[PDB]
Design an enzyme around this catalytic site. Structure first.
Site, PDB file in Angstrom:
ATOM      1  N   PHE A  32      -3.092  -1.985   8.628  1.00  0.00           N
ATOM      2  CA  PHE A  32      -3.651  -0.715   9.076  1.00  0.00           C
ATOM      3  C   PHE A  32      -3.376   0.435   8.113  1.00  0.00           C
ATOM      4  O   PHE A  32      -4.076   1.455   8.187  1.00  0.00           O
ATOM      5  CB  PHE A  32      -3.133  -0.415  10.493  1.00  0.00           C
ATOM      6  CG  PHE A  32      -1.632  -0.603  10.683  1.00  0.00           C
ATOM      7  CD1 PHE A  32      -0.718   0.284  10.133  1.00  0.00           C
ATOM      8  CD2 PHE A  32      -1.145  -1.645  11.468  1.00  0.00           C
ATOM      9  CE1 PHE A  32       0.650   0.122  10.333  1.00  0.00           C
ATOM     10  CE2 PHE A  32       0.221  -1.814  11.673  1.00  0.00           C
ATOM     11  CZ  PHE A  32       1.119  -0.928  11.105  1.00  0.00           C
ATOM     12  N   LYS A  50      -1.478   8.614  10.338  1.00  0.00           N
ATOM     13  CA  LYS A  50      -1.954   7.373   9.731  1.00  0.00           C
ATOM     14  C   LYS A  50      -2.581   7.652   8.369  1.00  0.00           C
ATOM     15  O   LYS A  50      -3.533   8.436   8.272  1.00  0.00           O
ATOM     16  CB  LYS A  50      -2.960   6.678  10.648  1.00  0.00           C
ATOM     17  CG  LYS A  50      -3.617   5.440  10.067  1.00  0.00           C
ATOM     18  CD  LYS A  50      -4.404   4.725  11.149  1.00  0.00           C
ATOM     19  CE  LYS A  50      -5.042   3.463  10.610  1.00  0.00           C
ATOM     20  NZ  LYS A  50      -5.816   2.740  11.655  1.00  0.00           N
ATOM     21  N   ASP A 141     -11.166  -5.314  17.312  1.00  0.00           N
ATOM     22  CA  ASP A 141      -9.761  -5.643  17.074  1.00  0.00           C
ATOM     23  C   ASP A 141      -8.967  -5.240  18.311  1.00  0.00           C
ATOM     24  O   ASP A 141      -7.938  -4.559  18.233  1.00  0.00           O
ATOM     25  CB  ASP A 141      -9.227  -4.949  15.810  1.00  0.00           C
ATOM     26  CG  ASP A 141      -7.947  -5.594  15.258  1.00  0.00           C
ATOM     27  OD1 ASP A 141      -7.699  -6.800  15.498  1.00  0.00           O
ATOM     28  OD2 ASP A 141      -7.186  -4.888  14.559  1.00  0.00           O
TER      29      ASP A 141
HETATM   30  C1  LIG Z   1       1.401  -0.257  16.548  1.00  0.00           C
HETATM   31  C2  LIG Z   1       0.417   0.224  15.691  1.00  0.00           C
HETATM   32  C3  LIG Z   1      -0.933   0.040  15.996  1.00  0.00           C
HETATM   33  C4  LIG Z   1      -1.944   0.508  15.147  1.00  0.00           C
HETATM   34  C5  LIG Z   1      -1.622   1.190  13.972  1.00  0.00           C
HETATM   35  N1  LIG Z   1      -2.571   1.660  13.131  1.00  0.00           N
HETATM   36  O1  LIG Z   1      -3.873   1.483  13.414  1.00  0.00           O
HETATM   37  O2  LIG Z   1      -2.183   2.355  11.897  1.00  0.00           O
HETATM   38  C6  LIG Z   1      -0.272   1.361  13.677  1.00  0.00           C
HETATM   39  C7  LIG Z   1       0.743   0.889  14.511  1.00  0.00           C
HETATM   40  S1  LIG Z   1       2.377   1.204  13.982  1.00  0.00           S
HETATM   41  O3  LIG Z   1       2.330   1.964  12.657  1.00  0.00           O
HETATM   42  O4  LIG Z   1       3.107  -0.118  13.746  1.00  0.00           O
HETATM   43  N2  LIG Z   1       3.226   2.147  15.095  1.00  0.00           N
HETATM   44  C8  LIG Z   1       4.379   1.519  15.800  1.00  0.00           C
HETATM   45  N3  LIG Z   1       2.492   3.027  15.574  1.00  0.00           N
HETATM   46  C9  LIG Z   1       3.007   4.022  16.330  1.00  0.00           C
HETATM   47  C10 LIG Z   1       2.184   4.960  16.824  1.00  0.00           C
HETATM   48  C11 LIG Z   1       2.631   5.708  17.814  1.00  0.00           C
HETATM   49  N4  LIG Z   1       1.650   6.479  18.258  1.00  0.00           N
HETATM   50  C12 LIG Z   1       0.554   6.162  17.573  1.00  0.00           C
HETATM   51  C13 LIG Z   1      -0.682   6.649  17.632  1.00  0.00           C
HETATM   52  C14 LIG Z   1      -1.681   6.151  16.810  1.00  0.00           C
HETATM   53  C15 LIG Z   1      -1.392   5.143  15.900  1.00  0.00           C
HETATM   54 BR1  LIG Z   1      -2.771   4.500  14.798  1.00  0.00          BR
HETATM   55  C16 LIG Z   1      -0.098   4.636  15.828  1.00  0.00           C
HETATM   56  N5  LIG Z   1       0.833   5.161  16.728  1.00  0.00           N
END
Ligand SMILES: Cc1ccc([N+](=O)[O-])cc1S(=O)(=O)N(C)/N=C/c1cnc2ccc(Br)cn12
Ligand SMILES: [Cl-]
Length: 340
Positions: A32, A50, A141
């Site tokens: 991601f 992100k 996904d």
């Molecule tokens: C778990 C998860 C799922 C999707 C993405 N993504 O599409 O970049 C990242 C992550 S993760 O960076 O491993 N992480 C734990 N994400 C935490 C997080 C918390 N709140 C949000 C909100 C949006 C996204 Br995108 C990720 N997060």
């Protein structure tokens, strides 16, 4: 310590604002992209950021998709900006948990995730799907890692539109596109003409997984993923194979009954829902709104229902007319009297 950027709001017109955040730490580094958490300086609010590599030759598909979306069961794009070889930065609402991590606590504790949480989380998933599908946006996904939770409010938020695409009939698409375990059988069969129902198959695989405590189709490989589906559903008929992929022209194993898949305890209505989602023929599967109106979710429409921690359920019936466009007569089931 303190980072200041000139970020563009996701909604509204292109009117960039100075935004300052702090407490920047890496919380994710995967396919991601790289994901940080941070605290916005004006409100103290937590954001996830992100960061993906973005060359200027094309517009970012995820950003174009995110900026359209405004829904309570979908993570909101607050701002975006550019940094650094050029990276796109999406500033998003922070959500503290995932269905993946929650399901895993219960499983490693040899405990079942309570059916009330199965209902809350899945209803909210289907609702998020009805919303994006109404725009022709398929997520492609749907899996437990992409379902974010606040465990105190029981709110679910779909995230990661980095695989998402507006599907239009005639324009073919790639067959190898979801997480193996959650991949629809038409995709395995090499359909390029697939619909948004691939997300509904994925939703079903999440539903079943939460009832079983483990993935229902834990495929060893891309090809064994179908052998695992055959075990439950049986071998697909010539008629079913044609509907999944018309080009696939041409081995029996019998269907194992749906009751005997799950534990004896499992509510029949939950089982009935699985069978209407995890069908071979894509067009037979429920739509996300039909799913939301399935009797399995009747407890969520009960006026007396509450969360086990004592608080009220989240916003479940505040439907917009956009959400109801695909089947407006479902309002008489989706919005109970006490909500009108
Ligand atoms: C778990 C998860 C799922 C999707 C993405 N993504 O599409 O970049 C990242 C992550 S993760 O960076 O491993 N992480 C734990 N994400 C935490 C997080 C918390 N709140 C949000 C909100 C949006 C996204 Br995108 C990720 N997060
Ligand atoms: Cl300007």
């Amino acid at each position: 310590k303190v980072t200041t950027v000139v970020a563009t709001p996701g909604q509204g017109p292109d009117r960039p604002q100075e935004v300052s955040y702090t407490d920047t730490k890496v919380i994710g580094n995967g396919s991601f992209g790289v994901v940080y958490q941070a605290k916005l300086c004006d409100s103290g609010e937590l954001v996830a950021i992100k960061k993906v590599l973005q060359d200027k030759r094309f517009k970012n598909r995820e950003l174009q998709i995110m900026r359209k979306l405004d829904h309570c069961n979908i993570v909101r794009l607050r701002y975006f900006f550019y940094s650094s070889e050029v990276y796109l930065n999406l500033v998003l609402d922070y959500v503290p948990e995932t269905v993946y991590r929650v399901a895993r606590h219960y499983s490693r504790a040899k405990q079942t995730l309570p059916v009330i949480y199965v209902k809350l989380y899945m209803y909210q998933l289907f609702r998020s799907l009805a919303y994006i599908h109404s725009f022709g946006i398929c997520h492609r996904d749907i899996k437990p890692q992409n379902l974010l939770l606040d465990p105190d409010t029981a709110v679910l938020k779909l995230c990661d539109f980095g695989s998402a695409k507006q599907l239009v009939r005639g324009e073919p698409n790639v067959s190898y596109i979801c997480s193996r375990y959650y991949r629809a059988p038409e995709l395995i069969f090499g359909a390029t003409d697939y619909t948004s129902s691939i997300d509904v198959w994925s939703a079903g695989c999440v539903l079943a997984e939460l009832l079983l405590g483990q993935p229902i189709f834990p495929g060893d490989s891309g090809v064994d993923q179908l052998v695992e589906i055959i075990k439950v559903l049986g071998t697909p008929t010539r008629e079913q194979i044609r509907e999944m992929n018309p080009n696939y022209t041409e081995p029996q194993i019998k269907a194992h009954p749906w009751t005997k898949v799950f534990r004896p305890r499992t509510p029949p209505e939950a089982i009935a829902l699985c069978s209407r989602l995890l069908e071979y023929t894509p067009t037979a599967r429920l739509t996300p709104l039909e799913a939301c109106a399935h009797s399995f979710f009747d407890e969520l429409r009960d006026p007396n229902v509450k969360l086990p921690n004592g608080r009220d359920t989240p916003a479940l019936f505040n439907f917009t007319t956009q959400e109801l466009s695909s089947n407006p007569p479902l309002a008489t089931i989706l919005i109970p009297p006490h909500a009108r």
